[PDB]
Design a protein around this ligand. Structure first.
Ligand SMILES: [Ca+2]
Ligand SMILES: [Ca+2]
Ligand SMILES: [Ca+2]
Ligand SMILES: [Ca+2]
Ligand SMILES: [Ca+2]
Ligand SMILES: [Ca+2]
Ligand SMILES: [Ca+2]
Lengths: 8, 332, 332, 332, 8, 8
């Protein structure tokens, strides 16, 4: 998985 | 269906109150006027068969001082399993009663405008005598079936002892609710163990909340009774009332108005509050906002507006206080 | 071949011990029963020619209280260079002796079940008198050539002074080992400088560990002597012994059993421990687990099981203590 | 044009000074010799029309002790809006005067080599009496038009009171500058409110900096006067001077040399410093470095080299001190 | 580089 | 958005 921000 | 997310909000403001506990004005750079500033990590892992494992680690950000007292994960630090049965969470979090009932506050339980019912009315000596979060918490949340939904929590005291209380920090509580989209209503009941002046005390709380979103505007309200009942006798009882409305303005804008009353029986005194708010969205992530509040204490009441990072103390008995916050909220 | 990784584990449990130092039971929500809960960042940068630069920043997570005392990187905070020569690391980390020898503990050096040899037997006054980690550490790890491998570390005292000790916190230590996959064996030797009751004291530790993985089951053991030798005379010496076995059960499951003996010469007393563990994997990342331990103190011994976040203190002299942890471990 | 970035630097070193305040040598593992070690998150969100929203949360890393005193975001914790008008930032940050003027220090304002002008010369009692950062800060930075650029900041005191000072922590300050690529020059002026020995005091600072990058080498310098002027009378005034040069060596290398003089008028004493530095880049992200410094105190001066994590205290009056740092800097 | 999770 | 490192 790659880390996403809050809004995807 | 698995993911990991690093997220947050920086909400910083200039703020002013016309009086503090000495009657002097204060102004400065504060935080968290529209949403609580935060930094967190969360994830969901698909385990198959509709079962998911989750984690969530979130702490408050204080942009005016760079988290000078140190960063933590006190907002939420859970691990969970969820599925068609609902969700079970282990770890520090909002207790189910506050998680559900604070949703009725149009000011998102932050800034100068919000409902003040979830507070430590009796100077209880526990870590979380505002009834908002608990250490050592296990919670269970049902699915929503036909609108109906419920939540339940138990937090272990672990023999925390203060004076004659040997179960400080225990929580037992839950809610039942109906949520169909436009209509929401909830009833929460909770008891915490605490101490006041070293004497064992129960913190009992019953809360009713409801809202209806008409689209053109939303109406919302809360009713709460909080009673700190000392085992040897005596009680500090507070009845808190709120009614509010919000409406979109011009696409991109939102206006909010909330009225609250706090009836503090132990000092036979009331306080009344009126707050006006505006939010102007520059994007889905970025908003400029302003809050204007007026808090009127009667008699022995000394409640103050919560201008976090500027002044959040009390005022002199029977004084009225005016506050303003203007800021920017940026989510990431 | 370069990357950056944000990672962690949330391991939270319910736990119980039947007695504390007053003889009362305790139960609650604790942490880190199967693996230590953590949050970290690490990276490897390919520099060319087989040379790599690394960093690693990791701190413990306490999900029951949201890291209430503040988040740090005390588990590891290194920068390193690695290559065909091995690896050199600068910064706080496990010292080589503990890094290698704790691998023989089937309970991953956490929870109620693990080997207790790496502990502060003498109430030394240094920061790390359990022999696990050091501040100000430089370490060198060789490659594994034909099975053989070694590690060496030096940690600077920086003139830390407590009473008559002016080199508190110094570490010098290392190990030699053989690791071929199924077979592992290691010998570690270390000395730290410390103080006990304000008097300069050496903490000397020799540790032997071995294991063999038969596939159907693994056998593992540890032998250690720890001696706190006070410069003016006198010593607190402890001999610690452990033997354990683990086996896969049904695909997805694992059972573990460990027996330990702690021979505390300064109080002429022994303690014996037996721990049974089960791990049930829901996925590679998510496991449910249970630990059951029984600790028998003889004579003046007062050792207690380490139910982190519930109770990890001692018990009354010569008492037996039973503990249980049941929880979930989620890696990300 | 929107992004989010998680970034940092681990810079750890071995360091030595030949004397401390008792005249004894000290050596150990320290940090931040070439660049300050840090961990941060930042982002930029394109709002349309050239308008952008930003956030930036950054704290110092101490790799020798794993941030033992707890991680924070005290380096910077801002939210901002930027556009063709320039940039406005809210939150704790470098004040504009230090942000701009420290750029003239060839040692990046860290390690044993840097300019020491931004320091608490008077033992002021404020949080940031080195003039580097401020709590409660609002700053405005202009665009660069034809080389010319400026910055302005105001930090709220919020009625912080120490003795007779009731506005401790106030900052007002700014700079004007010219920057065309090879040539840079800036003039900064600032005033902070503080207290010394409980008596209200102004911290006044004027700083001039300039540099020229010839390509084969760069010349840089700083001049500063810092005056702590006590309201009832009296002042602690310091004039600080620095001239330095740097040059690339062999591709991959860089040599630096800086000379400084600190004229401490309140004790009628001077200190002189000479520092030699080398940086060897293994990659754009990873460098090995060495610093060698010699600090000569005259008369009553007691200044010491800043070997962070080893020794950064003073020395005996009129003593000369030699220091060395050798380390690795890894950015991610 | 993009930030990855523990299991890559 | 996915989280990037310092050098993008
Ligand atoms: Ca969760
Ligand atoms: Ca503030
Ligand atoms: Ca490393
Ligand atoms: Ca912290
Ligand atoms: Ca607990
Ligand atoms: Ca910013
Ligand atoms: Ca150090």
């Amino acid at each position: 998985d790659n880390w996403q921000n809050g809004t995807s | 269906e698995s993911s990991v997310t690093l997220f947050g909000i920086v909400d910083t403001n200039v703020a002013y109150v016309n009086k503090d506990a000495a009657g002097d004005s204060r102004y400065g750079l504060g935080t968290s006027g529209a949403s609580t500033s935060r930094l967190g990590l969360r994830g969901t892992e698909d385990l198959g068969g509709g079962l998911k494992a989750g984690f969530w680690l979130e702490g408050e950000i204080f942009g005016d001082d760079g988290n000078a007292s140190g960063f933590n994960f006190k907002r939420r630090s859970t691990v969970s399993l969820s599925g068609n049965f609902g969700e079970v969470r282990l770890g520090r979090d909002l207790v189910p009663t506050s998680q559900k009932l604070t949703s009725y506050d149009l000011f998102s339980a932050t800034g100068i405008g919000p409902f003040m019912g979830f507070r430590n009315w009796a100077a209880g000596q526990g870590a979380d005598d505002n009834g908002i979060r608990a250490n050592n918490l296990i919670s269970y949340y049902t699915p929503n079936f036909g609108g109906f939904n419920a939540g339940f929590g138990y937090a272990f005291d672990e023999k925390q002892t203060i004076g004659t209380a040997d179960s400080v920090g225990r929580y037992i509580g839950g809610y039942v609710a109906y949520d169909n989209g436009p209509l929401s209503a909830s009833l929460g009941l909770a008891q915490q163990k605490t101490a006041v002046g070293g004497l064992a005390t129960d913190r009992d709380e019953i809360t009713l909340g409801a809202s209806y979103n008409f689209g053109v505007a939303k109406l919302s309200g809360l009713l709460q009774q909080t009673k700190f009942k000392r085992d040897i006798g005596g009680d500090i009882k507070t009845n808190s009332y709120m009614l509010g409305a919000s409406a979109p303005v011009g696409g991109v804008g939102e206006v909010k108005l909330q009225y609250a009353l706090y009836d503090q029986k132990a000092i036979d005194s009331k306080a009344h509050q009126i707050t006006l708010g505006y939010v102007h969205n520059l994007s889905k992530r970025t908003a400029l906002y302003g809050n204007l509040a007026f808090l009127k204490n009667k008699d022995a009441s000394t409640l103050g507006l919560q201008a976090k990072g500027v002044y959040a103390g009390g005022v002199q008995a029977g004084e009225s206080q005016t506050g303003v916050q203007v800021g920017i909220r940026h989510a990431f």
